[PDB]
Amino acid sequence: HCEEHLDPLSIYCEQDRTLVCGVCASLGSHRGHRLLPAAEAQARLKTQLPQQKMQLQEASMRKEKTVAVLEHQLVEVEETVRQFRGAVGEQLGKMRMFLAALESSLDREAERVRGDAGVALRRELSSLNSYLEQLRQMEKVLEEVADKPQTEFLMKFSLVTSRLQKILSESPPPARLDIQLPVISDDFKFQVWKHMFRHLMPALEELTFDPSSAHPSLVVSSSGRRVECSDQKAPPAGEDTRQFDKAVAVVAQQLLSQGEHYWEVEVGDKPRWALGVMAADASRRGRLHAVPSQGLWLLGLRDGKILEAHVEAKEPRALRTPERPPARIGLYLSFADGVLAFYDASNPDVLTPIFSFHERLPGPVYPIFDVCWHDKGKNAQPLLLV
Amino acid sequence: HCEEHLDPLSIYCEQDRTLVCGVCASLGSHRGHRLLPAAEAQARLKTQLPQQKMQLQEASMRKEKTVAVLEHQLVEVEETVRQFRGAVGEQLGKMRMFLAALESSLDREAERVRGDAGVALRRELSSLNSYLEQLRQMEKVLEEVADKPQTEFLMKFSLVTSRLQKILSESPPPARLDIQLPVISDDFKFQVWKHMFRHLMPALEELTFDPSSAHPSLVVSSSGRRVECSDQKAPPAGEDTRQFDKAVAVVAQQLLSQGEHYWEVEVGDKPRWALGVMAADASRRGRLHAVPSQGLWLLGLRDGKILEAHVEAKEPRALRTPERPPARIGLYLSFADGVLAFYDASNPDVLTPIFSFHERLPGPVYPIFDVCWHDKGKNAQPLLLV
Ligand SMILES: [Zn+2]
Ligand SMILES: [Zn+2]
Ligand SMILES: [Zn+2]
Ligand SMILES: [Zn+2]
């Protein structure tokens, strides 16, 4: 039953795995092959069956493994798309909400201005309208009684004279102040955009200084909000990893480890200071090396107008100092983006950036504040936690 | 009818303007006054009447003029409130529109990603499911055939072996499918805010150069969008104040006189160039003085990386050159705020400021572009009007 050479099917090619006839084995598909008979070939395959069953089941198992992983991936793709869309909506609705609130506030402004102006104008209008009624009566009665008996004539004339005299010699309205309603012209959109940044910042990280960590020559007041140096000698710090010994500074009690945070520090006219974050595991001993590899991310100002960033280098990098020694610094921290950014927050409405590090933070960090050395009393400025 | 002394009323008090009887005029409230009789008093007042009526008319005229002025003031206050509300609505709807458009674009992108991922995953699932059906058929036939004729048994066993071999060597990826799905981060708000500025700008002032004013050593192409110098000589400039003759430059055909405008100029790697505005009354002849007092507001770049602002002084002011030579400059102009602002538009999506003039402009001005000289063919870069 060869169906190709018309012989019974008796020869089995091993290296071809096909049952054949004699002609294809003599001069055909199997001229130089390893041949076997059909009987012992069948007897071999009846024993080879379990291996084939095992291999079939294993192949099905692998393909099913891939099916399961891919369907789980389909569910994961759906869920990730949902999360992306929802978070985009949330973080754009934040700014849209800011816009709606500002427009509502401006509507309040305009309505209040209109109401007060209308109140004052209608007050004067009522006064003048009563006045006009008075005067119309004056003219009518004078004309109508300029023919009456002498007694009536003189009485009415005297009354008219008195009424006209007083209403002419009446005191004007007292002194009000206008509510001008300042008008917006072109830069209003730009200023709204500038103002939106402060609201883009997260809720203020309400921090307090940790006197349990401060230098012994420092003093903390205002319930953890004020740190300053002193013009007097102090006992040396007790043996502790949680206390500075040479560089006068202090960390906050709160440990930042997740999410995003923002805090402002008031520095005023301080000639030298330093601000930033510090790795919690870092060592607070000796004169410090200001490099991020040692757990120190610091922005400094020296000599009153020299603003320095303590970058990974041999000497801290200088920065383009603003037109003033900044009076308030703002610090933004994010782990999901690994950034600590510095801002000149002297303007409560606009923040201008100063510097920002770019390193996936090992975490966690303590807010660190370097109120600089005594300098013989020429650096008595404090640090104020806003 | 004195009703207080019960006498007829006959005496008129001059300094009091009141009719009285004889007793109160003799020794009473009007005892030492200048008195007159009722007859001559009436004869005087009947002739004084027209003057009093005239004075009444004058007072009425004053009060009615004031009433009219106050009603006009009320109406003007109403209209001013309307205008204020409308302008606030317009300039906030700009940003709301940007937000909505960005959110819709991101939603479209995310939906495209989800659809493509679903298509690919269902493709792989169909492939693997057809494979599993094949393998179930393999197992079925293997279980059913272990007694059949030599031809049937060996034929089907060889076919099963071949099919399993082929589907094993045509194996799809055993792993999961790459998706690179969009993630939402903390910096999304900051990036949207940075992007919002370019859309806060007005619609691009699509400008065309004015060949009627350019230097004869210049050439305008690309339908008014491209201006270049030439590496070959040209005829001397024709007699016109409205044509540059010595300083190679060109103004736009459009005249800016009111409102706000914004236009971008692509400069690429051009080493020296200048951009800005020029007063229409200014003279475009001879060697020019680059000072706003002579109607020229210009920012220039020389030596490829030296960015200077041609401010009102004896020497051009230096500027903070960026870490790159800017590839596109943006110019914003406003009259109601008197500002000409320059931006590094090398990124057309985010703008970093470069300089800004601050003068309520005398007006009006033509956008002027100083495409610098050939420099012996080493300054052949063009100026491209976006
Ligand atoms: Zn063979
Ligand atoms: Zn054959
Ligand atoms: Zn009397
Ligand atoms: Zn009297």
Numbering used by the authors:
A (entry chain B), B (entry chain A): 85 to 470
Paper quotes:
The coiled-coil domains (CCDs) form the main scaffold of an antiparallel dimer with a length of approximately 17 nm. Owing to these interdomain interactions, two PRYSPRY domains are located on the opposite side of the CCDs across the H3:H3′ helices. Recent cryo-electron microscopy (EM) analysis of TRIM72 and the crystal structure of TRIM72 ΔRING also revealed that the CCD ends are dynamic. These results suggest that the flexibility of long TRIM CCDs is suitable for recognizing curved cellular structures, such as phospholipid membranes and viral capsids, and filamentous structures, such as dsRNA and DNA.
Tripartite motif-containing protein (TRIM)72 (mitsugumin 53; MG53) has been determined to rapidly nucleate vesicles at the site of membrane damage, but the underlying molecular mechanisms remain poorly understood. Here we present the structure of Mus musculus TRIM72, a complete model of a TRIM E3 ubiquitin ligase. Its domain organization includes an RBCC domain followed by a PRY motif associated with a SPRY domain identified in splA kinase and ryanodine receptors (PRYSPRY) domain.
